[PDB]
C-alpha cells in the first residue's frame, strides 16, 4: 500500500482527529517539487472545507487526514486539529500518470503545506 509522506511541523491538540465521513476545514498550499505553486487556499480567499475519506479529494489527502481510514500505517503520523504539516503525495495518490494537463502534468509528486483548522 503506497502511503503519503507526512511531516509534522507544529503539533495540534492530539485529541481531535477526523474520521472518514467527517468534514474538515484546512489551510493549504500546493506546490510541485520544483517549488512552483499550483494551488492554495489563499488563492481562494477562504479555507477549504471538504468531507474526508470518501474520494472527494485526492487519495493522499484522504489517507493523511483520516490516518489511513483509521487503521494507521508505518511512518504515518496522525494530524490533529491545529496541526501544521507537510504532505508529500506521490503521483498515484494524486493525479496519477495522466495528471490533469495543463494544470498538473503526468506523474507529478505534490507537496502540500497544510494546517487542520477544524473538524466538523
Author numbering: 3 to 122
Please quote the paper that reports this structure.
Three different crystal forms of the apo C. albicans FKBP12, to resolutions of 1.99, 2.3, and 2.4 Å, were obtained. While the C. albicans apo FKBP12 structure is very similar to previously determined FKBP12 structures, an unexpected finding that emerged from analysis of the crystal packing was that despite being obtained under very different crystallization conditions with distinct crystal lattices, all three C. albicans apo FKBP12 structures displayed the same intermolecular interactions between subunits. What is notable about this interaction is that the 80s loop of one subunit docks into the active site of the adjacent subunit and vice versa, suggesting that the loop may act as a substrate. Indeed, Pro104, which is located at the tip of the loop, is inserted most deeply into the pocket and is surrounded by residues that have been implicated, via mutagenesis, to be involved in FKBP PPIase activity. Three residues, in particular, were implicated as important for FKBP12 catalysis and correspond to Val59, Asp41, and Tyr97 in the C. albicans protein. These residues all make direct contacts with Pro104, which rests within an aromatic cleft formed by Tyr30, Phe50, and Trp63. Although most of the contacts that hold the loop in position in the active site are with the central Pro104, additional hydrophobic contacts with Ile102, Pro103, and Ile105 are provided, while Arg100 makes hydrogen bonds with the carbonyl oxygens at the edge of the pocket. Notably, the interface in the C. albicans FKBP12-FKBP12 interaction is minimal (burying 592 Å2 from solvent), which suggests that, like known substrate-enzyme complexes, the proteins form a weak interaction; typical dimer interfaces bury >2,000 Å2 of surface from solvent. Comparison of the C. albicans FKBP12 apo structure with FKBP12-FK506 structures reveals that the 80s loop binds in the same pocket as FK506. Interestingly, unlike the C. albicans apo FKBP12 structures, which were all captured with Pro104 in the cis conformation, in the A. fumigatus structure, Pro90 in one subunit was bound in the cis conformation and Pro90 in the other was bound in the trans state, thus potentially providing a snapshot of self-catalysis.
The 12-kDa FK506-binding protein (FKBP12) is a ubiquitously expressed peptidyl-prolyl isomerase with considerable homology between fungal pathogens and is thus a prime candidate for future targeting efforts to generate a panfungal strategy. PPIase proteins all catalyze the cis/trans isomerization of peptide bonds N terminal to proline residues in polypeptide chains. In addition to its role as a PPIase, FKBP12 is a member of the immunophilin family and is the target of the immunosuppressive drugs FK506 and rapamycin. Three extended loops, which have been called the 40s loop (between β2 and β3), the 50s loop (between β3′ and α1), and the 80s loop (between β4 and β5), surround a deep active-site pocket that binds both FK506 and rapamycin.
